[PDB]
Amino acid sequence: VNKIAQESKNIWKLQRAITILDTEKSFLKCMRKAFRSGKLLQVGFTPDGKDDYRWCFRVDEVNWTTW
Amino acid sequence: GKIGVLAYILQREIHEPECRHLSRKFTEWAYGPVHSSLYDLSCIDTCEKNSVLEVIAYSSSETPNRHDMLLVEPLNRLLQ
Amino acid sequence: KSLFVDSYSEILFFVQSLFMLVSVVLYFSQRKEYVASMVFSLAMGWTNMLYYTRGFQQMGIYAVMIEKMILRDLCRFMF
Amino acid sequence: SYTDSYYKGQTALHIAIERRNMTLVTLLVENGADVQAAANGDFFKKTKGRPGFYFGELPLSLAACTNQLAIVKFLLQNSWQPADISARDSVGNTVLHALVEVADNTVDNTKFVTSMYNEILILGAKLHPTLKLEEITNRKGLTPLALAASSGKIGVLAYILQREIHEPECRHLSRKFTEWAYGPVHSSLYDLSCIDTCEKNSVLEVIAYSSSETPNRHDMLLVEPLNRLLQDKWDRFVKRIFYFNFFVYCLYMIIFTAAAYYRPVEGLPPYKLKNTVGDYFRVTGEILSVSGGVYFFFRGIQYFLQRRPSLKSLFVDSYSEILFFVQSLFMLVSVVLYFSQRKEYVASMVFSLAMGWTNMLYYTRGFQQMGIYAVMIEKMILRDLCRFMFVYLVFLFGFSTAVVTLIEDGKYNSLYSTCLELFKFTIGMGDLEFTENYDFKAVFIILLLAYVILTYILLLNMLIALMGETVNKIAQESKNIWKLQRAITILDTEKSFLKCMRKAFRSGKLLQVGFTPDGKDDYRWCFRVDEVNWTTW
Amino acid sequence: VYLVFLFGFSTAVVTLIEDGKYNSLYSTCLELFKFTIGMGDLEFTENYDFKAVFIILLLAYVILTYILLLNMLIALMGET
Amino acid sequence: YYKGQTALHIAIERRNMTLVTLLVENGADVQAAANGDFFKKTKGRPGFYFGELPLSLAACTNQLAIV
Numbered sequence: 001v002n003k004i005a006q007e008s009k010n011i012w013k014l015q016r017a018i019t020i021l022d023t024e025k026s027f028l029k030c031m032r033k034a035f036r037s038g039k040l041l042q043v044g045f046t047p048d049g050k051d052d053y054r055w056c057f058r059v060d061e062v063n064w065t066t067w
Numbered sequence: 068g069k070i071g072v073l074a075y076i077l078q079r080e081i082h083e084p085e086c087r088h089l090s091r092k093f094t095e096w097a098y099g100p101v102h103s104s105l106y107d108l109s110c111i112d113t114c115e116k117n118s119v120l121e122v123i124a125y126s127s128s129e130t131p132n133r134h135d136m137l138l139v140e141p142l143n144r145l146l147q
Numbered sequence: 148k149s150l151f152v153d154s155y156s157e158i159l160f161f162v163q164s165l166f167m168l169v170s171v172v173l174y175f176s177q178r179k180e181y182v183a184s185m186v187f188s189l190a191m192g193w194t195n196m197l198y199y200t201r202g203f204q205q206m207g208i209y210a211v212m213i214e215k216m217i218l219r220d221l222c223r224f225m226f
Numbered sequence: 227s228y229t230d231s232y233y234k235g236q237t238a239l240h241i242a243i244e245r246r247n248m249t250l251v252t253l254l255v256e257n258g259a260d261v262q263a264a265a266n267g268d269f270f271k272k273t274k275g276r277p278g279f280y281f282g283e284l285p286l287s288l289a290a291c292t293n294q295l296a297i298v299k300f301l302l303q304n305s306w307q308p309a310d311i312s313a314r315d316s317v318g319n320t321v322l323h324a325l326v327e328v329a330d331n332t333v334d335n336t337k338f339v340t341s342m343y344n345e346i347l348i349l350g351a352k353l354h355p356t357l358k359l360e361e362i363t364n365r366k367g368l369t370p371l372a373l374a375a376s377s378g379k380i381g382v383l384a385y386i387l388q389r390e391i392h393e394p395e396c397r398h399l400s401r402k403f404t405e406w407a408y409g410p411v412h413s414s415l416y417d418l419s420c421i422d423t424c425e426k427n428s429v430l431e432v433i434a435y436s437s438s439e440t441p442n443r444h445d446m447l448l449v450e451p452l453n454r455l456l457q458d459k460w461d462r463f464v465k466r467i468f469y470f471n472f473f474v475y476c477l478y479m480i481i482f483t484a485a486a487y488y489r490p491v492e493g494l495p496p497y498k499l500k501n502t503v504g505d506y507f508r509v510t511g512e513i514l515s516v517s518g519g520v521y522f523f524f525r526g527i528q529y530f531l532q533r534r535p536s537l538k539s540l541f542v543d544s545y546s547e548i549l550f551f552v553q554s555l556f557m558l559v560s561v562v563l564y565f566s567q568r569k570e571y572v573a574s575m576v577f578s579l580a581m582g583w584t585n586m587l588y589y590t591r592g593f594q595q596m597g598i599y600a601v602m603i604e605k606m607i608l609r610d611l612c613r614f615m616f617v618y619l620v621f622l623f624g625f626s627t628a629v630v631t632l633i634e635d636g637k638y639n640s641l642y643s644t645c646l647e648l649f650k651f652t653i654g655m656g657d658l659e660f661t662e663n664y665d666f667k668a669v670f671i672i673l674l675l676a677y678v679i680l681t682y683i684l685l686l687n688m689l690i691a692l693m694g695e696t697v698n699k700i701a702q703e704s705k706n707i708w709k710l711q712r713a714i715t716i717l718d719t720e721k722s723f724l725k726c727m728r729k730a731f732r733s734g735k736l737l738q739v740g741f742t743p744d745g746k747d748d749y750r751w752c753f754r755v756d757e758v759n760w761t762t763w
Numbered sequence: 764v765y766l767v768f769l770f771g772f773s774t775a776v777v778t779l780i781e782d783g784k785y786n787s788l789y790s791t792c793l794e795l796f797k798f799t800i801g802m803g804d805l806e807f808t809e810n811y812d813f814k815a816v817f818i819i820l821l822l823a824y825v826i827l828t829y830i831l832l833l834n835m836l837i838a839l840m841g842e843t
Numbered sequence: 844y845y846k847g848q849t850a851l852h853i854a855i856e857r858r859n860m861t862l863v864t865l866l867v868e869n870g871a872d873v874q875a876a877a878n879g880d881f882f883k884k885t886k887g888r889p890g891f892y893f894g895e896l897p898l899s900l901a902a903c904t905n906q907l908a909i910v
């Protein structure tokens with residue numbers, strides 16, 4: 001137990017990930033909300049003039065350095 | 068199981084013209100200390116065959132770092 | 148090899164159901180040993196209730212530690 | 227400015243400060259930009275779960291919060307329109323309230339918030355010497371110090387409580403002073419205003435009676451003045467008052483034990499009082515037992531009324547009040563069943579007696595080693611015993627149901643008896659051949675051996691291992707929780723006090739420097755702390 | 764702490780017991796001490812009413828002392 | 844409490860070499876015993892024991908030059 005703390009946390013997270021994937025693959029109702037991110041415009045400027053929407057996921061962060 | 072390369076790719080951010088579209092991490096806006104990152108999730112959440120979540124989770128148990136790969140930031144936050 | 152060294156929960160739930168079906172077969176075969184199969188299925192199912200400790204961080208991590216204790220320390224000790 | 231509800235009130239000055247453009251700020255202030263505009267859109271409010279950033283809604287607070295000393299200096303000291311340093315937002319927060327609010331106790335955050343707090347206060351003293359800036363209360367009635375204490379901002383509280391400012395015309399802002407010096411030794415004086423008592427939001431009251439969601443409620447009492455202050459109050463009077471209370475509770479439990487032990491064995495109470503000495507003592511003991519139960523009942527009611535826990539803070543926290551209250555509830559139910567002519571008053575009474583003797587562990591606080599030990603017992607019960615009992619009871623019920631299913635037509639074949647027999651393995655008394663009323667002996671013994679391996683060999687030894695990890699990891703947390711428990715005891719003892727004690731203050735009206743903004747001499751009820759430093763001769 | 768718990772639950776149990784062989788603080792204290800050495804009977808008497816109260820008291824004693832305090836003693840001796 | 848404290852003791856206390864030299868030039872008693880209770884043990888009262896003598900004060904204050 002002194003040595004399997006982080007290993008057990010990671011293995012639990014993997015088990016819950018397998019549960020999540022099984023739940024979303026079974027799903028029994030043809031629900032589209034499992035697509036989890038929403039279609040945002042990242043840059044809107046590819047090498048050509050077209051715009052790129054890439055289903056991004058928002059993560060807010062705070063830093064007190066590199067103002 | 069190349070956790071180093073996966074950790075590089077999933078939060079890749081390239082700051083130069085004509086290459087920002089290659090990035091997979093974007094900063095939409097930034098106040099003084101606060102700023103909101105955006106991770107790509109193409110080929111992560113769902114795709115044709117080889118979603119990274121499905122590839123990691125349904126690995127064959129001989130992958131080196133399968134337990135630790137889901138700790139890479141967008142994967143852990145997406146699963147939560 | 149991955150059928151046994153990994154995915155223990157699927158194997159345990161499958162074996163629970165196998166005991167249930169063998170119990171049904173012995174029940175309709177006019178054998179009292181259906182009670183033996185039934186009680187093994189019942190005990191295994193109640194122990195397989197530990198599967199659902201995932202989804203709770205503290206109980207899930209505790210269950211994972213139980214798994215690793217069984218595989219590493221209890222196995223060496225029991226040998 | 228913007229009229230959108232998300233960014234309502236945002237001027238170009240807010241953007242200029244945000245972009246860290248000093249020249250644009252100077253040009254905007256030159257052209258008459260309002261330096262007290264309230265940016266109060268929904269983006270700039272609290273509720274961090276939404277996207278947003280709160281800074282106090284004002285550009286001076288924005289410049290302070292973004293670590294821009296030049297812009298706050300300019301906005302306060304520009305030639306066109308100086309900014310009111312005592313300006314207030316919709317919450318009533320000033321610049322210092324905003325600096326307290328934005329803190330998150332990280333090292334860089336603590337550094338910049340400390341420096342900006344110091345500079346803003348110094349500039350406030352210079353521009354407004356008569357202003358008591360830190361006494362301004364927001365709409366919740368909290369000063370910046372009380373806000374820091376209530377929100378768990380240990381980084382800012384730890385700075386404020388031992389603040390030293392040495393500049394002339396600014397030493398009155400200090401809260402730590404030095405009365406005298408010698409060679410290695412010097413005697414420090416701490417301000418102590420709004421710490422021991424101010425009737426509104428004293429820092430000890432704010433920390434101790436926090437709602438358990440404060441991040442650092444256990445760590446905040448480790449700062450230099452508060453720990454010595456609580457130890458001083460303890461050794462002054464609360465040690466004696468607490469030990470008297472412990473003695474009285476011991477007498478109460480001894481009397482209750484004696485009265486319950488010699489209960490009449492005849493049926494159907496109330497019991498006629500036989501004219502003999504022993505029964506007179508018995509009736510006196512019973513009366514005192516019920517009296518003490520009523521006392522603890524009303525104490526628990528007073529606790530719940532004075533605090534009003536919000537339906538979860540009375541289960542995650544304050545376990546002792548609940549336990550003493552339940553003890554008194556069992557006592558009162560015992561009285562009701564006694565006078566209702568029911569024998570079940572013995573059941574209520576024995577639960578009260580057992581719970582009271584276990585509640586004797588409450589008084590281990592006030593003794594450091596026993597108090598820390600009792601805190602560790604609490605944490606074991608909440609974390610390791612709870613997880614263990616969940617998994618253990620699942621295994622026990624599963625194997626008991628399997629075994630009692632296997633058993634047919636015996637003295638066993640009730641679920642309770644089989645559960646008890648399987649439980650006997652845990653206490654080292656399992657028979658392992660407690661019945662033969664079955665067919666399939668191999669199935670019976672396989673079930674019992676599997677139960678033994680999964681519970682007795684595995685889970686109990688795993689519980690020992692996990693408790694080992696816990697004691698390895700909860701040492702400092704246990705000491706901090708013990709100190710918080712003793713602090714709560716100190717505050718309750720001071721607020722009870724039973725004789726109108728005048729000695730609420732610690733160490734006299736010492737003169738710190740005697741140089742106020744005016745010529746008057748300020749007395750602050752200081753607290754003395756003698757310190758020795760061999761460096762800095 | 765153990766003697767406080769032992770005396771408390773012994774007083775509760777002997778209060779519950781009426782007109783029996785044990786029915787005394789010494790005998791009940793000894794019977795509750797026997798749980799510590801792995802010899803507690805758990806049905807040492809039936810001279811009471813309210814079997815549920817008796818067994819609840821004994822199980823609470825067992826959990827608070829044998830399962831908790833002894834294993835905690837092992838853990839704290841490990842730390843020491 | 845400050846009984847027996849001479850000007851030499853204050854001069855050593857303030858780390859002023861010049862004042863110590865001037866006082867010793869003016870016949871200051873280099874064996875004066877500061878018998879005040881502020882310069883003794885029993886720390887329940889504030890103080891600092893140093894052996895009561897200017898030489899011991901100089902040694903105890905890391906003033907090697909004055910020693």
Ligand SMILES: CCCCCCCCCCCCC(=O)O[C@@H](COC(=O)CCC)COP(=O)(O)O[C@H]1[C@H](O)[C@@H](O)[C@@H](O)[C@@H](O)[C@@H]1O
Pocket residue numbers: 011014015018128153154155156157159187190191194195196197198213214215217218676680
């Ligand atoms: C008669 C009665 C007999 C009962 C006997 C059995 C008692 C135990 C019952 C416990 C039931 C709990 C459970 O459901 O099974 C536990 C396994 O516990 C054991 O060790 C059993 C040893 C045999 C978790 O198995 P899991 O499916 O989560 O496997 C993990 C993957 O998911 C994950 O991705 C990783 O690859 C990870 O490395 C894998 O392990």
Ligand SMILES: CCCCCCCCCCCCC(=O)O[C@@H](COC(=O)CCC)COP(=O)(O)O[C@H]1[C@H](O)[C@@H](O)[C@@H](O)[C@@H](O)[C@@H]1O
Pocket residue numbers: 438542543544545546547549577580581584585586587588603604605607608707710711714823827
């Ligand atoms: C039939 C008989 C059953 C008896 C069962 C119970 C046995 C233990 C009885 C022990 C009595 C000692 C006591 O009085 O209770 C212990 C709690 O022990 C338990 O875990 C009981 C679980 C129920 C201390 O509770 P405390 O008031 O100190 O709460 C702490 C705050 O003070 C502090 O500020 C912090 O916020 C901290 O986070 C809080 O927790």
Ligand SMILES: CCCCCCCCCCCCCCCC(=O)O[C@H](COC(=O)CCCCCC)COP(=O)(O)OCCN
Pocket residue numbers: 640641642643645646649814815818819822
């Ligand atoms: C750490 C926990 C360990 C568990 C230990 C075993 C107790 C759990 C029992 C759960 C199974 C369901 C109980 C059903 C109660 C009941 O209805 O059974 C009653 C027994 O009544 C009681 O003692 C109530 C017990 C109160 C429970 C206090 C936790 C009657 O039949 P008897 O065979 O006993 O007497 C028959 C005489 N010919």
Ligand SMILES: CCCCCCCCCCCCCCCC(=O)O[C@H](COC(=O)CCCCCC)COP(=O)(O)OCCN
Pocket residue numbers: 787788789790792793796
């Ligand atoms: C870790 C501690 C574990 C506690 C173990 C139990 C002991 C605690 C007893 C406390 C209750 C008060 C004792 C009262 C003594 C007494 O008066 O009881 C006497 C027996 O006296 C003694 O053995 C003295 C015991 C010495 C105590 C050595 C620690 C006789 O009654 P019996 O029912 O036994 O015999 C009756 C035959 N007709």
